[PDB]
Every structure is written in structure tokens, then in C-alpha cells.
Amino acid sequence: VTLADAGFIKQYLICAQKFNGLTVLPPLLTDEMIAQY
Amino acid sequence: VSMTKTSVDCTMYICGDSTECSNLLLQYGSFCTQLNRALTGIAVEQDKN
Amino acid sequence: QCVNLTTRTQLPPAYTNSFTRGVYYPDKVFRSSVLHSTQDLFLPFFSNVTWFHAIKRFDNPVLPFNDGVYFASTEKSNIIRGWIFGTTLDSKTQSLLIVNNATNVVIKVCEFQFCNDPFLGVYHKNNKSWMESEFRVYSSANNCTFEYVSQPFLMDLEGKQGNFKNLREFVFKNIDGYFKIYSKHTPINLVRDLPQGFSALEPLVDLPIGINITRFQTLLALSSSGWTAGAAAYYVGYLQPRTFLLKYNENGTITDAVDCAL
Amino acid sequence: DPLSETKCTLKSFTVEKGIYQTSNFRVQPTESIVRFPNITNLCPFGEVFNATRFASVYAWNRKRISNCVADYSVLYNSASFSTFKCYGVSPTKLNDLCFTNVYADSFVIRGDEVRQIAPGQTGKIADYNYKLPDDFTGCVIAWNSNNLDSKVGGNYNYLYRLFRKSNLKPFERDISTEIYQAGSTPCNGVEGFNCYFPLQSYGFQPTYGVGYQPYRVVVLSFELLHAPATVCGPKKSTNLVKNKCVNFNFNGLTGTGVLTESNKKFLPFQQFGRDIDDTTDAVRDPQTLEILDITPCSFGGVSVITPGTNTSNQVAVLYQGVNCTEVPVAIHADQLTPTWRVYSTGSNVFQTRAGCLIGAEHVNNSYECDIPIGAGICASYQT
Amino acid sequence: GAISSVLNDILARLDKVEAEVQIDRLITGRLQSLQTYVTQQLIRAAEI
Amino acid sequence: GAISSVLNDILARLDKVEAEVQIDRLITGRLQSLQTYVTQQLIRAAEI
Numbered sequence A: 001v002t003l004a005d006a007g008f009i010k011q012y013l014i015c016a017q018k019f020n021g022l023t024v025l026p027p028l029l030t031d032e033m034i035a036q037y
Numbered sequence B: 001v002s003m004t005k006t007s008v009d010c011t012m013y014i015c016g017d018s019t020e021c022s023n024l025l026l027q028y029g030s031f032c033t034q035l036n037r038a039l040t041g042i043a044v045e046q047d048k049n
Numbered sequence C: 001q002c003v004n005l006t007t008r009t010q011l012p013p014a015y016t017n018s019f020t021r022g023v024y025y026p027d028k029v030f031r032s033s034v035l036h037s038t039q040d041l042f043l044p045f046f047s048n049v050t051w052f053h054a055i056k057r058f059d060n061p062v063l064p065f066n067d068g069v070y071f072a073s074t075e076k077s078n079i080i081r082g083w084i085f086g087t088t089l090d091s092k093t094q095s096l097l098i099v100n101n102a103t104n105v106v107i108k109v110c111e112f113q114f115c116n117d118p119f120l121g122v123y124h125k126n127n128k129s130w131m132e133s134e135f136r137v138y139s140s141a142n143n144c145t146f147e148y149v150s151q152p153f154l155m156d157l158e159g160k161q162g163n164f165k166n167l168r169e170f171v172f173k174n175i176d177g178y179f180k181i182y183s184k185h186t187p188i189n190l191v192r193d194l195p196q197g198f199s200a201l202e203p204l205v206d207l208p209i210g211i212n213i214t215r216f217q218t219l220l221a222l223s224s225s226g227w228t229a230g231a232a233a234y235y236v237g238y239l240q241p242r243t244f245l246l247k248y249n250e251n252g253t254i255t256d257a258v259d260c261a262l
Numbered sequence D: 001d002p003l004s005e006t007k008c009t010l011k012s013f014t015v016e017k018g019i020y021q022t023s024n025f026r027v028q029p030t031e032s033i034v035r036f037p038n039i040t041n042l043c044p045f046g047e048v049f050n051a052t053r054f055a056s057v058y059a060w061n062r063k064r065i066s067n068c069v070a071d072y073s074v075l076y077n078s079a080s081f082s083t084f085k086c087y088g089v090s091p092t093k094l095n096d097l098c099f100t101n102v103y104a105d106s107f108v109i110r111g112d113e114v115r116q117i118a119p120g121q122t123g124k125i126a127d128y129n130y131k132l133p134d135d136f137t138g139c140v141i142a143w144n145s146n147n148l149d150s151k152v153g154g155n156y157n158y159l160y161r162l163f164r165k166s167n168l169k170p171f172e173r174d175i176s177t178e179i180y181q182a183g184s185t186p187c188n189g190v191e192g193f194n195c196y197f198p199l200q201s202y203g204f205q206p207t208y209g210v211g212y213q214p215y216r217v218v219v220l221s222f223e224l225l226h227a228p229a230t231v232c233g234p235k236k237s238t239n240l241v242k243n244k245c246v247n248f249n250f251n252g253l254t255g256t257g258v259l260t261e262s263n264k265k266f267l268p269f270q271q272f273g274r275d276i277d278d279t280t281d282a283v284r285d286p287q288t289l290e291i292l293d294i295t296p297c298s299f300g301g302v303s304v305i306t307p308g309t310n311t312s313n314q315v316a317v318l319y320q321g322v323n324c325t326e327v328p329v330a331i332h333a334d335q336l337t338p339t340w341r342v343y344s345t346g347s348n349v350f351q352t353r354a355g356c357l358i359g360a361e362h363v364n365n366s367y368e369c370d371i372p373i374g375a376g377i378c379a380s381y382q383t
Numbered sequence E, F: 001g002a003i004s005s006v007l008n009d010i011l012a013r014l015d016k017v018e019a020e021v022q023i024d025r026l027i028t029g030r031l032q033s034l035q036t037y038v039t040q041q042l043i044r045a046a047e048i
Ligand SMILES: *[C@@H]1O[C@H](CO)[C@@H](O[C@@H]2O[C@H](CO)[C@@H](O)[C@H](O)[C@H]2NC(C)=O)[C@H](O)[C@H]1NC(C)=O
Pocket: C002, C003, C004, C116
């Protein structure tokens, strides 16, 4: 699935706002915290 | 279980860095506050899920 | 000087498929790693180009210029030398000339009286060395307007190698008062067909000429009749309005394209 | 302060425990930069407007204009012009711009007909002899010329077309003097029953009333922002500065951002570059031809973390998705929408994956989550 | 239906009154584009 | 709020510059009528 996510992340890991106003926020739980649960 | 938490600013999107367009956008009232709130409610729900 | 070179063989016109050739940068803008979609006058993919030779042969008819033209020549000794473009060609209106002589290129717009069977002439006759000697093109040019010329050089006027080493490609459009030229050079090692592959044409020059073009004809290199014509050839395709998808790579060069209506 | 901005956002004097959104921050530009192509030739408007003789409305003179400074304010600020109407620019703005190419058209027309020149009109001028395109960008400039070419018998050199088989395309020219067939009959020869010579003449005698008098028209028409510009207003260019936020203008690409040396390999014919979003991300300076990457100068969402009004007026500020090396860049020597700025004193600054958090002590304890920041970080109010 | 889809290219070319009719077109259409996107996203969020 | 709902009547009665402003009203109202239908269908699709 990251082979699809990485497309979305570069088109839209300190994510930042694009000039069109699009912003991608981080989840509250990291993939390491979901792995630990 | 979730989808990417995306927040769009309705002011930045409609009127990006124009104060002229921002002054006109205010004539429509709350629609940008309501749209930023609606997207923020979706973003909070991804953590809940 | 105008003259009729009727010492030529009579056959029908040849045809061949364009393949994916005849794509050019649609606007003067940089893009990179992008799949851009554009609507413009392109040569449709896998379309019938007509095919013409000078060899026995001197295929130099007047052809339509409807919506502009892809022209490409498989070349040796530089036999393809220029083009005449216009709406009458017999002095009653303006017309455009392009010539590459041995030294410097000339581009001119005037109310020309063109010769019916024009050419440029090179002499080898008992001199063991090719030398530029004749130009037969127009008698008169009175009300002349756009004047342009290159800085001077010398090109080669000699060559008797086997397969064609040079492909020279051009696209011409007469739109919004500008005659836009796109052109490109590639080496190739191929005998009698357009090379299958992909490469774009860059804008060569932008000419503010305004004039009506309806038809066009090509100027080739060559005791006033009877001669030797060296083996060289050119292909002609007509542009059409189409939508194209263009792969700009990491350098910002077009490396592949899709014709949306193919 | 950030707390009072949350009180104002939530419409309450008491804000509850949580993390809240506020105004986005954005480093405002320090200064303007103008970069027009460095030329000096003043444009040939003299022999456009103050010309000897003027073509007919069927044979309208076209003069191309290029490689020159066009002070359109010198035309517009004259008292002489009766009309100066413009269809994709305002006449005050013309100096602030460069154009890809320009055509001045010219003719003389009767004063009652000048209303026909405007784009997408109709009438015998607009339908059969001079049509402006329905999306025209340019200006139509008109004035009376009665005392310049009227003759007391009449200046019968001014002709116009009344008859044409079908309405002409925009900017089409028609010099034809062939005879027109109104009825069903063929009409070979110079004349006949219901056959017409398609050109008629104006009675330009200096005696006539306004509306019947001869009016001089120019149409300035021009194309925009898709080629290396050839004509510009007299706006002085300025020294090019980099890495600072500025109100740039290159050839009429007005914008706001930071300029920097790009590694982009533009080919010699390209002047602008664009992103995947098709917004212009790079420009080639028209004076000293290097490629500079237009980057939007730092901005982002701002969020305020509070334990609730009941407990404290302490708050922490999350600058969403920005490295806070760019928070000291927001020094009050230039403006931002967030007019408040005391947090910048620092000593409790913490970079997170979610952006940079100011005003909160980072600890190596992991407690239960309380106020959620993102990327595994939470905040809470404790000793 | 405005003279441009680029917002600065309107404010550069026109004045403080002729621009507003063009800016309001972009405000109207853009706002509708967000109202659409947010509706698709609210209905999507309900499915997720 | 156009002069008529019949698309070809506006094009016959008015000139090409005024008729464009009448067709702007029909396109906008119909497009809102379609967006209303598709939003209502998406809410129904979620219920089904
Ligand atoms: C070349 O041959 C053509 C005919 O094949 C000649 O063209 C004629 O020219 C005269 C005027 O000189 C016209 O009245 C004829 O109508 C033309 N014929 C055609 C079919 O167009 C031409 O004159 C010859 N030129 C030379 C230099 O020999």
C-alpha cells in the first residue's frame, strides 16, 4: 500500500501546506504505535 | 479503518494571499468557517476510528 | 532566369506511415516529470505521409498547406535547401521564401514572381570539386516587407555515402499572424524509410509575417537542361487539431506521447 | 495573544480543554521587485495616432508594435480622446504590464457608428466590415477628426461596405469590389436589377452635425503571459534579490514568494516553468538570463493548545507542518496576520512530525494521552 | 467565465471596481468546488 | 431567473453578448439541479 501512499504524499515525512491550501495532517497513532497495539 | 487526514483552508484555496478576494469572501458569511469545521470533524474522526 | 527541367521520369506519388513522429513543444513553458494534456495542431499518429525523391527523379510539386505541415527529409550532401510558401506564387500577392544557400540562410517576404520549376544549382563539371553556381527561383520581388538573414557560415555541398546519415524534421504553422517554425536534427543509419521512435521538435524561429499561406513547394539543390540530381528524399504530412498527452521527463524533455483520438 | 484568538474564534470568554484551530500564519513580503526586459526604444505610437491618412472601415490599416516601451498613460491622460474603452484591462493599469505582441488597427468611421466597434456587437460595421473577437483583450480609442479631412463637397474617399454574403470572422479583411446579388437572379456584369455595388461613401463635409461627422478610431489589441514579452510599460526594473519574501513582477507575472538559483534545465526558448498543479514555479530573468525557482514564502495553519480557561491562561502554539527555523524569520520587522509574537523568545521549542510546538516542555516520560497533537505526541498540564 | 483563472493576473490588469465582478466569479465557482469536495468527503468519512 | 427555460429561445431572441449572460443562469441552475440529485443519490446509496 505505501507504493500508493508515496504518490499521494509527493503530489499533495514532515508534511506541509501547498499553495492551493491543501494540508495533510499526521495520524495520532504512528505506524509503530499501531504495530505495538 | 481510516483515510488520510486532509485539511483544506477555504480562504487559502479560494483567495490565496489576496486581501481583495478575502474582503469579498467575507460577504458570503460563515461558509469557509463551516467548510474548515466540516473537514476538521472528518480529520478528528480518523483518530477515533 | 526561369527554366523548365522537363528531363524527369513520370510515376505516381508514394505514401508511408508517420509512426509516432511529428510532436513538438506546444508552448514556450518548462515542465518536468509531468503527464501534460494539450490541444493543438499535431501530425496524427500512424497517418499517411506522402513521399518524394530527387535522384532520373525531381519530385517538386506544389502541395496544399492546409492547417500547416510536417516536413522531413532523409538527407546526404544537403540537397533539400528551402521552401516557398504563399497564396498565389505569381506576383499578385505577398509570399514567403526560405533558402539555405552555401553560406547563410535567408528568409524574405515579398510580392514575388516565382519561376514555375525552381531550384538551386551546384557545379562539379570538369572541376573535381562541388561549387555553388546557380539560383533559379523568382524573376522579380518589388513590394518587399519582412527581411531576415543568418550570420554567415559554410555548409557541405558534397557526399556519396550509402544509407542516409541525416534526418532533418520541420513543422510549420501559420497561426494568429505568426509563421512558427519547429525543427530538429537527428543522425540515423537507415536506407529508405522514416525511423520508428520518438523525438520532439523545438521552436526554431518565430516569424511575424502576417501573410496568407495556402500552398507550398520545396527548393532542392541540383547545358541549361540535362544535369545530375543526387539521391535525396522528403516526406510530407499535414497537421490536424488533436489532443495529445505528453510525458515530460526529469530533464523536462518529451520522451513519449499519446494521441488521444488514435 | 493565542489564547484570546481562540476566545475570539470559539465566541466565548471561556475556552474548554483542547487543541484549537486559529488564523494561518504567512511571512509577508519585505519589498517589491520589478524585472522587465531591459530595452529603451519608445514605441511608434506617434505615426499610429497622429498619422497622415486613415484607411477605410473595409480596408482598416494594421500596424504591428514590438520591442519597445509603451507609456499608455501618455495616451490615456490626454484630454483629446472622446472614448478610450477597454475590454480586458482598465486604462490606468496598462503601464503595469508587458505584452507578447500588439496590433494597432486604424480607420475613420461616422460618429453614430462608433458604438459598433465594441466586442460581440452587431450592425453593418460589426457584421460585415470590422468585427472584434467575442473575447477581445485591448482598447478602442476614438475621437472626432472633422477639421482634419472633411471637404465641403464631401470627402468621398471614405468608403464602407453595406452588402456581404455572410457575416465576417473576427479580424477578417475584405477588399472585394465584385457585385452583390440580393434577389434570386444571377448578375454577371457591373450592375443589374437588385444587384449592388457593395461599397457606399460617407458625406464628410466640415458642416455636418456630430454623429454624421468623421470619427477617428484606433483599436489597440494585445496578447498576454504565454511568450517572451516584447512591449512593456515604462515601469523601472529594480535589483534582483533572493531568499527573502518579495512582491515580484517578471514581464507581468505578478506574485509573492522567494527567488533562488534553480537547478532547472530550461531550454533556450522557454521563459516560464510550471508545477504538476500547472502554477508557475520558475522564471527566467529577462535581463540576466538565469532560471530562478519561485517558492511560496513560508506559511501554514496555526493551532493553540489549552488546558481550559478554568485551569490556566498558559497555552502552547503548534505551527502546523513547518520547521520553526522559519518562526524567528517571522520577526516583527515585517508583518504577519498573527500580530502577537511573544513565544518567539523560546527556550521551550519542540520540533514534532506534526510541525513545531512552542510553549510546551518536552519530557522523556510517556503518560496517557490527554490533548492529541499528532504523530504519537500529546500535551497536558502538569508539574 | 472570468477573464482569467489566475487571481493575481486579474488584480494586475484591472481596477478596484472592474476586478470585483471577475473575482466574485472565481469566489462563486471555487466555493462551489469546495462545497462539492466536502460533501463527497463527508459521505466518504461515513463509509470509512 | 433567465428570460426563459427554452435554451434555443434565448439564443434566437437575444444577441450573442447578452444571450451568454442568460445561458450562464441556465447552466448554473441546472448544474445545481444535477449536483442536488447526485448528492441525494449518494446519501441514498449509503442507506441502501
Ligand atoms: C514552362 O512550361 C509551362 C507550360 O508547361 C509554361 O507555362 C505557360 O506560360 C504562359 C505564359 O508564359 C501561360 O500563358 C500559359 O497558360 C502557361 N501554361 C500553363 C499550363 O500554366 C511556361 O511559360 C514555361 N516557362 C519557361 C521559362 O519555359
